[model samples]
Structures are given as structure tokens and as C-alpha cells.
Target chain A: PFATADIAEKMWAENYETTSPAPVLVAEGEQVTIPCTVMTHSWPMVSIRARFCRSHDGSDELILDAVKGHRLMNGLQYRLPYATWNFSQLHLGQIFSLTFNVSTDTAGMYECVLRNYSHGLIMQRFVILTQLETLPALGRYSLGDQIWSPTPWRLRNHDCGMYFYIGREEPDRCWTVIQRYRL
Target chain B: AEKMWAENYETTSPAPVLVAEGEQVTIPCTVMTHSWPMVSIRARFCRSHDGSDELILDAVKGHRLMNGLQYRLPYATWNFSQLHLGQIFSLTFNVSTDTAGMYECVLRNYSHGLIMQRFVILTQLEPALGRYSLGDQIWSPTPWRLRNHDCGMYYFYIGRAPDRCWTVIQRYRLP
Candidate 1:
């Protein structure tokens, strides 16, 4: 008879991926969606926690939290207005998404954390929201047309009357333009 | 009393520091505590990578860089005054495309596990174009156009430079 000692190794394969861009640019009042997916392999029971947090200035706010497809904390209605969450299970993974309307005050860095049952951090993904202001126009604009201005024309006085038209025949129903004079 | 003091521990820093490329910026992490201080403090500044953290600075063992790329932590000691007032935890580094990411300052005690942590994001500001030459067209609803064909038009200006003036050169027929 031979007495021997056997050493066995057990490893849990877990990984997560995010489809959100590094910096998500949105016009003010536009809608934006960010998504993240988590997959666990070689583990029979898949239990994980997902949390979404937003940081602005120096303050951090937890917007959403879930465990094994069960929601623990949801701040979308009160803390974060106009924001919602979507969670679904995959074959061996889970998908978590956040959709919100982008406002000036909502511009910040968002983080998604996926952790295990023992509170060990497995993955983290960050997304930045950049808000864009709409440039005011004096005349009508059609799709695929080009527009140029040296500087912002909204700060100047509307005295110099310049009109633009698409066709040469109709000058009466042309586009009205405001040209700023150099001082 | 001990539980009350532990709940009051927090960290503060100005997050999301946006600066131009090649410029210098300092991110300071200040730890706030209620009268009691830790027995021994261990501080580490790290950059967050994929599934792992890259150590940038260790204040206790004087480990400056596990991975280095022009990052500096001036103070190495973790005294009570230095950690509380945030005098020693300031990380100064130059900003570039490769250095733009998330960083964290973690403070821990020898006996206890975790004290406080702060995260800072470095972002590179987009450069402003100073000059536009001949045949430059500015169109918007968006910064750049998706298609080249004409649909409808707004305040379209085509650059005709003798001095600083623009003119509308062509006309489109309405369908």
C-alpha cells in the first residue's frame, strides 16, 4: 500500500464586458444608454452583485444595485430623475443596462461594479457623459445642409439684416439671416 | 464609541480633473476622521486596469513605482497630521493620452482591513482649432456631417478668404 498526498486546485472563471464608449457625448435633453454584461464559467451556482454609481465633482451616488437578478437598491426614480435600469439573464451570464436623459447637471463619470457573493470586486467599468449645447440658428435649416460662423452669433445685436434662400427664384419666402459686423 | 468613530471615516478629493494634453495636474486625497487615528496606516496609490490594479506609489515602504510613467508622490510618511490634513497624499503627474484613466488612493490600517478610499479620473481636454483655411465648411445640428449630399440648408458659409469673409457659392433646386 502506498500513502500519498494529493493537491487539487479549484479556480472560478468569471469575467465581465461593457459595450459603453469611453466618453458618451449627448446633446442636452437627449437620451443615452449604457450597457454591461457579466459571465461566469466553471461555476455551478452563479451569484454576483452589480452596482451602478455616478461621481460628480467629489460626491458619489449609488444609482442602482442588484444581486443575482434581484434588485437591492434603486435610485433611478428619486435620486436620479429620468433614469431607468434594465436587467436580463443570459445563457451563462447577465446583462445590465442604464438608460437616462442627459441634462447639464447629469454630466458626470459613471461606474459599474461587478462583485462576488463575498464582496470581492470582480470588475469595474467607467463611462463619462459629455453634454452638448444646441447652437441657435436664425434661419431654417434642412437635413444635410452646411452652416458656418466665425464666432458665436448669439452674443451680437440683430441689426444687420442678411437673408439667404435655397433657390434663386423665390426671394420672398427666403431664409432670414443675421450677420454680425466687426467693430 | 469605536463603532461611531469608524462610521465617520471618509475621504475627499476633486474628481474628474480635466486638463489639456502634456499639462501637469495634482490630485489630492484628504482623509477625514473623528478624534481617533489608526494604530498604523498603510497607503497605496494605484491605477485601475483591466481586472487588476497597477500600483503607482506606496507611501509606507517607499515603493515609488511598480509601474512608472512620470508619476510622483511627494510624501512617503503616513503620520496623523499628514493623512488628516491631506498634506502628504497629493499625486502630481503629467497628463497625456496614455495616462488618461481612473486612479484610486487607498488607506488601510495594519490591524483593521480598510480605512478609506478615493477615486479620481484624469481626462484630456480637446484642443480648440484656431484657424480654418480655404474651402472650409461649417455645418451643424452635429459637429461633422454624416452624408455629403445636400438635403436642406441652414446658415451655410463657404470660406472665401481675401480678408475674413464667407459667401454662399451655389444654389440647390427644390424638389
Candidate 2:
């Protein structure tokens, strides 16, 4: 079927939406994040828990969980703006990625969120997927996963000790790849 | 005057076993015969498949012969048998992945020849990651919705799941 080179070419040829957030201006007590988003294949189910780390050091090498989401595959299907903590599933035409608030404690190398799953299990001589119920949200977050970006995607808003990161795609790459960095 | 040569020679090419990859395994070239003309006796290693010669080792010279007499032959050892006029000599040869195959050692003293053949086998090892159970990803609002709410438009996005945590933000795209 499709090889990596082929996928790379296809990815570049096709244009998905992007979200490059404007520099956030928060006072000394303000914890704001510049949001950037990617168009989604399908929105994820919200209950899926994730962590948010900062992509600071400009180099994007060091990523801190600015929020409590994990580093993971594309997740974040939270559909409700005001819904309670259950029933999180993203529908068609959903968006993945966002910007949110974090404490200075949330500041560091880079930002990232991750999640884990057994994927599937072998039980009774058969494999099955274990489902999760009601996951946690990063309470300190103000912006959330928002701010669409350009096709290739980069970071903006490096004011106030906040850093601007240069994210890059690999040559026929995968995520967890680095783009740029700063101190 | 009398001739005291009244016995048959015995031989053995027992299978050799090896577990460590690339490490040397020694195969002893043995025979249950006598070594009267020890000086005239010499053993050579040969390779065969289905009983046909694929390669012969005596004259292979200083090449990297893994299973040949030059490689597997003892540092400097020879033995004899009392059961036969013709003595049996032992040869030790090296074995590994490339050398794990059928080998034959032949005895020749000016013309009379006796040979024995055996096979060697080897194996290699490795390790692999484990599996998991749970969900992944976290929360927040999209800028489009914020934008929708920003420009005074309604976001028409909505969703839900079974036993999972969801957040719905459906506003109107138009109006």
C-alpha cells in the first residue's frame, strides 16, 4: 500500500488546517499559552486523559507538562464546552491541538500531553480493548487546545520570558520529532 | 617373521551441539581403529550433502576454514587403537553458524581409506515490548469555538461517549 515516502509526499500535497496562536499577554500572575491547532481526522473522545508540557528552551527539545496531559498520539476529543466530566467522544470534522494556561511551574523546555492504553488485551484466549470512564482535565488551563495553524505548523508569541518554538516534521517522519529551540 | 594385522577399524562422527552464537564449538574427529603406521596416517575434513561431496578440507590451505582439520584438529595430539593394525586418530574442529553442517573425516594410509561423518547444529536468542490498558488525551476549547463565541457566532460542535468523559460546545456557525 502506502510507504512512508509516499505518505510524506501526500501529506505535503494535501493541505490540512493550522492554528498559530497570537502572543498572549498575561500579567505577572497571568498564565496564558499561545494556541495552535491542527485539523482532525475525527475528534477524540474527551474522557481520554492527557498532560500538557511546555515546549520552551526555544529548541523544543525540552517539553514540560504545562498541564497534566500525557505525551500521546493525537487525543483530545472533548466535545462539550460546559458538559460534565463524562461522555467524551469527538465527532466528525473535529480539531486536534490547542493552547491553554499554565503556572510558571508549568514552564519549561516544551509543551506536550500524553496518554496510555493497553490498546487491547489477551483474555480467555482472545484480545479485547479496555474502555475508560471519566478522565481528568487540566484545571489550571485557561486557553485550552485551540488556535489553528498553517499546514507545516510553528509556534508564536515569545514575549515575557515565554518562548517561541520552531516545530518541524521529520523527513518522512513521525511525531516526537523536534523543530527548533531557545534558552 | 609374522604379521599381526587382524582387526577392523571403528569410527565416529557424532553430532555436535551448540547454543552460543558465533562462539566456537569443538567436534572431535574419532575412530575406533589402530594407529600402527601413525606417521603415514592423516585425517581430512570434508563437507557433503545427501552423501555427495560439496567441499573437501585438507588442501583448503590457510583459508578461514571453520570445520576443517586445520581449524578443528587438535593443537598437536594423536592416538592409536589396539583392536586394528590401522590405528584411529582423533581430530578436533571448530563449529558455528556458518560451520553447522555435515562433515566427514577420512583416514588414509597410502591407499586404504575409512571415513566417518556427522552434523552440527546451533541457535541464537533475542527479546521483545509488552502491552497496556487505559485511555489517553486531555481537555479544553477550540479557538474556532472561542472564535465563534468571539465574533458573536454560535459553535455547532457537539459529541459524547459511553462511560467516558466528554465536554460539549455546540454553537451556531451561522447567525
Candidate 3:
């Protein structure tokens, strides 16, 4: 009974802090890295398992599992080459870091999970992967060099499209359609 | 005809509900029916795991409702005690930094794996507006909106208390 208690204690005693990347909006064909890192208390961890799943909590379609350096499958599209399972923590360089051509099919939820040697699920993070024709450079764009195009692009039932314009002399508002295509 | 039954139910949540760490947050999962009664329907809260839908807490028939182990961790509980037919399926929990994740409150048992309704919420580590933080009884009369620009993100305002002038704080995106 004491030994069983020890195993359970070993599994549940360590309260860990798991960290991962955020919502990654990427261009269709560029390399993106969904980073994952783990940290634990004073306990010495024996092994670590990092899983890439199609769902939020590590329960859906298992894409890959980098557990103790053993991956379920390996390829250029979906691979965890920088994953290392050490004594104290499981360090994954870039969990699902890859590059592929984007399409309407590229938009969905992707999750990364880290479990200890005891297989106790600890850390979980979700990356909502969305594709764009191009991501807007995050900054203020003044209309000083404005080149306007009347691109009325309300394709679907939802207002999910883009525009091409420069800036304004003073303050201009009112006509930017809200555009984030979400299910 | 497929869209008819799917649009029959609506799921709603408090959009942009702000909260600071350690405060108790109740994320209400309310379902509104269009023209039919969900008298024989079932509901579950799920998180995407491995690549399929992992059922967390479920209730129907003679079966008992239960919370998944992750929801039962210390200081955290997602009680389905509020699963009334005409009321909200209120999922309440104490907020933790680890609690920052995505979840789907789903009502099902209609079609083959047809999601009748769904509500999504994302919790980030930030001070809730009007809640106190960083050793102050009440921080800022309210939370400040940090803006991002060509240079960087920051908060700028005119204040006359600690000093009678304008102030600017360098804001960095949360990691």
C-alpha cells in the first residue's frame, strides 16, 4: 500500500507550470513555431511526453507524441525534432514547428500537451491556426500615400474579407468591415 | 434542411468578461431554444484532446453527471449543479494562471456527433477592470487599455496625483 502511495505521490505531488505559444496567425507557406516549455518544483522528473493533438485538451486526434525522445511518427510537415526529455523537465524547442502551403483547410484548432513520466496530464495549450492571404503589418497606417481600391469582398454570410487603402489627412472612420472568419 | 436543426439552439456567454487572478469567475453557459423543447437532450463540456472530442462532464438518462479529473484539481471545480432545462448551465470555477485555456460548453445527442450549441472563452493573465492588483487596494479607477503602434505598445494618460503631468508606461505583449 505504501509503494502504491509512493507511485501516486510521484505522479501527483509535483504541481507544474506549463507554458506554450499563443494564437498563431500565419501565412499559408511559411515556417511557424508553436513553442512549448515546462517547469516543475524540486522534484526530479524522470521522463516527459509532449503530444500534438487536433483538440484543445490532448484528447482528440494524436498527431505526434515526443515522449522520452520516442515520437509516434516523423516528417517535415509534422515533427518535433527539438524535443528533449531530461531529468527535471520536458523541453520542446518548437512543438509543431513546420511549413506548408495553406488553404481553406489550414484553419482549425491545434493543441500541445506535456505529461510527466507517470503519464499524468499536466500542461495544455491551444493554438487557433488561421490562414490569411496576408497578415497586416501590426502598426498605424496613415493614409498619406493612399491608393484606394473598391474591393467589396463580403463573400460568405459573415463579413470575412479584406481591404487595400492607405491613410487620411485628419481622422477617418466608419467603413472598415469587421473581418475575422471564425466558425 | 441541415442548417434548420443546427440553428434551432443558440449558445451564449458574457463576451469579454474581464477578471484578475485568484478571483472566482463564473462563466455562464446558457442555451436558448428556438421552437422546440430539449426535453430529451444531453449536454457536456469538452476540451480538444489528441484529435477527437474528449467528453469531460456528461449527464443523461440514468447515468450520473461527473466532472473530469482536470476540473477537480485543487481549488478548481466545474459544477453542473446548475443544469436546469430553462436556466443556464453555469460552469463556475476559481481562476488560476493554469486555468487560462480554451473550452467548449457543448449540448449534443441530436445527430451523430452534431454539436447543438457551443460557447468559447479565452482567459488571459491580466488585471480585471476595477479589481485591485500589485499591492494596491484598487488599482487605477479602472483598467487601462494598452495600445500598440509602429514603435511599441504603451499606455499614456494625463494624471495629477503622484505628479501633476502626463505619464507613459512601456507596455509589452504578454508571453
Please list the residue runs of candidate 3 whose C-alpha ends up more than 4 Å from where it truly belongs after superposition.
A1-183, B1-18, B32-66, B69-75, B80-87, B110-175
Q: Over 4 Å off in model 2, which ranges?
A: A1-183, B1-18, B35-88, B110-112, B117-175
Candidate 2's error at B16, in angstroms?
6.1
- lDDT of model 3 at position B106: 49
| Residue range B32-92, candidate 3, lDDT tens digits | 2112222112222222222222233343221324334333334544433221111233344
Please report how far candidate 1 places residue B69 from its true position, in Å: 49
Give the Å error, residue A112, model 3.
40
lDDT of 2 by residue, A56-171 (tens): 21111111122332333222222112211111111111112233233332322122212112111111000000111111111111112221122112332343332232233112
- Model 1 C-alpha lDDT per residue in residues A84-158, reported as the tens digit of each score: 666553322344556666554564444444433233333433332232222234221111112322112322332
Give the best candidate by lDDT: 1
Fnat, model by model in order, equals: 0.00, 0.00, 0.00
Rank order (by DockQ, best first) = 3, 1, 2
TM-score of chain A of 3: 0.34
Question: Across residues B1-175, which tens digit of lDDT does each residue of candidate 2 receive?
Answer: 1112212111112122222323333333322222322122222222221222222222112122222233433443323222110122222333333333433344334344444333323221001101111111111122132111222212112111110101110110111
Give interface RMSD, per candidate.
25.8, 38.2, 20.7
lDDT-sorted candidate list, best first:
1, 3, 2
lDDT of 1 by residue, B1-175 (tens): 0111222122121122222444444433333221222322222222232332323334333344443323333322222223111113344455444454544444433233333433222222111111111112111111122222133321222121110111111111101
